[PDB]
Amino acid sequence: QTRSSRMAGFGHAVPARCVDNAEIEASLGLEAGWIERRTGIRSRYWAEAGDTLSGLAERAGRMALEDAKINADDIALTLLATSTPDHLLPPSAPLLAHRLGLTRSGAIDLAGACSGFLYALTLADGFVRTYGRAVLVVAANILSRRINPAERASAVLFADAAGAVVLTPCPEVKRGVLSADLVADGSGYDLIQIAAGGSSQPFSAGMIAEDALMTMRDGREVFSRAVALMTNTSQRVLHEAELTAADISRFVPHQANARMSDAVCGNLGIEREKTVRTIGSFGNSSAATIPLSLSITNAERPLAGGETLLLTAAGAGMTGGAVVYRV
Amino acid sequence: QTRSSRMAGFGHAVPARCVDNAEIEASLGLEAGWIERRTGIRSRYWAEAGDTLSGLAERAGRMALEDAKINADDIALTLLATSTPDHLLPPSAPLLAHRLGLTRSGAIDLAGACSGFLYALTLADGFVRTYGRAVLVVAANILSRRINPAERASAVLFADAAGAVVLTPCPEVKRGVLSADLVADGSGYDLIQIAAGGSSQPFSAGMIAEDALMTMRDGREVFSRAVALMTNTSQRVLHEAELTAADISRFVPHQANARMSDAVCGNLGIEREKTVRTIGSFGNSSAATIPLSLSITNAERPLAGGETLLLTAAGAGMTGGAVVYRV
């Protein structure tokens, strides 16, 4: 009797430190307006001393739970898509569920850079539909602690945020997730990478500091690959839902880079004016950007029944995905 | 038309270094037979220098694909449950799918300690039944590079392995995953932990080497909490599937500790003779244990149609789960 899922509540959260382009442009010896011109970012939020991923996730999640007016017993599963868990062990999701008082909820972390939220959304939808119970989906990242301040290509982009969606079970068809496409291309695995800390190079006393920090080895190759993945996944979820770009009420791409957002919009023939854009104030927080944008646009104009959303993302891996969701 | 998933193929792999109890006992200044008395482990496999998580996972994955006689184009999604990815970024799953030639497969890492494979299995079953496409589920860990060699409670248990299962879409009902129950208990989050490395304490020059390695802070408390979670999840999936333990053909618990496996069997009324037990040769490899045991038990005696499998695990988090699968 459950045939679909709906986004019943939305939330998002950022740390308090607001970091303008001008502060970063000073550190990197760049003139004024350099960052905004090349990325569309004007400011971003960065975590401060102590700030935890789970505490950030918790605030977005609590906001989404309260928005859904759902009792906390109703959450059967908590999916936390993150690249930056509190600890390498255990995963952060069980602590997130505990801090939200979700006493009947399972919990697991998903590592998909971003593409993590779209993967988590798709699998959560399949859970909601298979078991007929609600799932909380949170995406959150503290990328600021992974930024190599000397690497301009990354230092000007990445930001910290959390977004959350509550998925509840629905009895009716031809709504909810109409189509979904999840791709991966490991030929680009080394383009966005942290050298040290996995099992391939465990962290050791006296290792090179920067080996713990993100690097983007070829910013232009990544741009081209990411645009192709978001374009191609979007085109085929549209084809599978039997829609065109003209039927999408709101386009919510991963907020990698405004120039990249524009490129995808062009490739798909989607007006700039239908595209949710939050990178300007929140930067690129990887898997958090799409649920943060959904929280933002829903606050600005509540999502109305019959609206169709197109969500797409691409990330390190490489990974990519798209989802057509109908309110 | 798809109404269930079937485990169409199995695989497992381990590294080449065999570590007898005697070598670790000497290390810890322990009398002979100490480890086997208390854990039932006789030996375990550890990684050698240059071995990689993704390479280990690939060997298990390929054995599972070949056992399934499945064309690589059919794999639409690769789920890698690991705590020990090659790199902190990107996830290891896209590389694994790339090295296995799965050119149509998405890919994402799940981090669930363990419980990771049972979460992976549950969500993949939802994917299979929702989209009608095959999924490769791998669980793999190289815990040895995270072992604190001085900590007796963890150094004698943990091991390296990979296990893999090909889930294919099946038209018929009343088989496959009959019930699943996924739980989390974050009040025990600190019991099994790595201090440094996540976003809470990022890795730094000059930091205490110890902080990069696992610690189990209260083994007795872990033992009780994990036994309870495996017992309680197992009872409720049996109740949901309207089966008794006597209907279960093979019981396949997470291989944490033979004494813990004995305690769960004892609570549930399950014969030692029905329990798959691989911990004696393969140790505790977290999420890899259950699919490794499934591949072992299937090699010894092919899973026959009609057989009913009870799977259960608990882990750091706390996390836990149970699955009833009918062949």
Ligand SMILES: CC(C)(COP(=O)(O)OP(=O)(O)OC[C@H]1O[C@@H](n2cnc3c(N)ncnc32)[C@H](O)[C@@H]1OP(=O)(O)O)[C@@H](O)C(=O)NCCC(=O)NCCS
């Ligand atoms: C566009 C992108 C490169 C972002 O980085 P960026 O803001 O452009 O930063 P860059 O320094 O690389 O931009 C190019 C700049 O370097 C300069 N530059 C680089 N190589 C140069 C060269 N060989 N000669 C001259 N100038 C060069 C460019 O000309 C330009 O600076 P300048 O005009 O002042 O000389 C892109 O990779 C991106 O946005 N990726 C998204 C991050 C991510 O992973 N998101 C997840 C989804 S993809």
Ligand SMILES: CC(C)(COP(=O)(O)OP(=O)(O)OC[C@H]1O[C@@H](n2cnc3c(N)ncnc32)[C@H](O)[C@@H]1OP(=O)(O)O)[C@@H](O)C(=O)NCCC(=O)NCCS
């Ligand atoms: C059983 C468990 C405690 C670890 O295994 P273990 O080898 O039995 O751990 P211990 O070393 O504490 O066993 C008792 C021993 O510790 C010794 N010990 C520990 N602290 C001691 C102390 N303060 N004083 C005296 N002895 C002490 C006991 O005397 C006994 O040692 P001895 O027989 O040589 O004298 C348990 O935590 C476990 O196995 N957990 C599973 C691992 C896991 O996380 N699996 C994933 C699913 S949970």
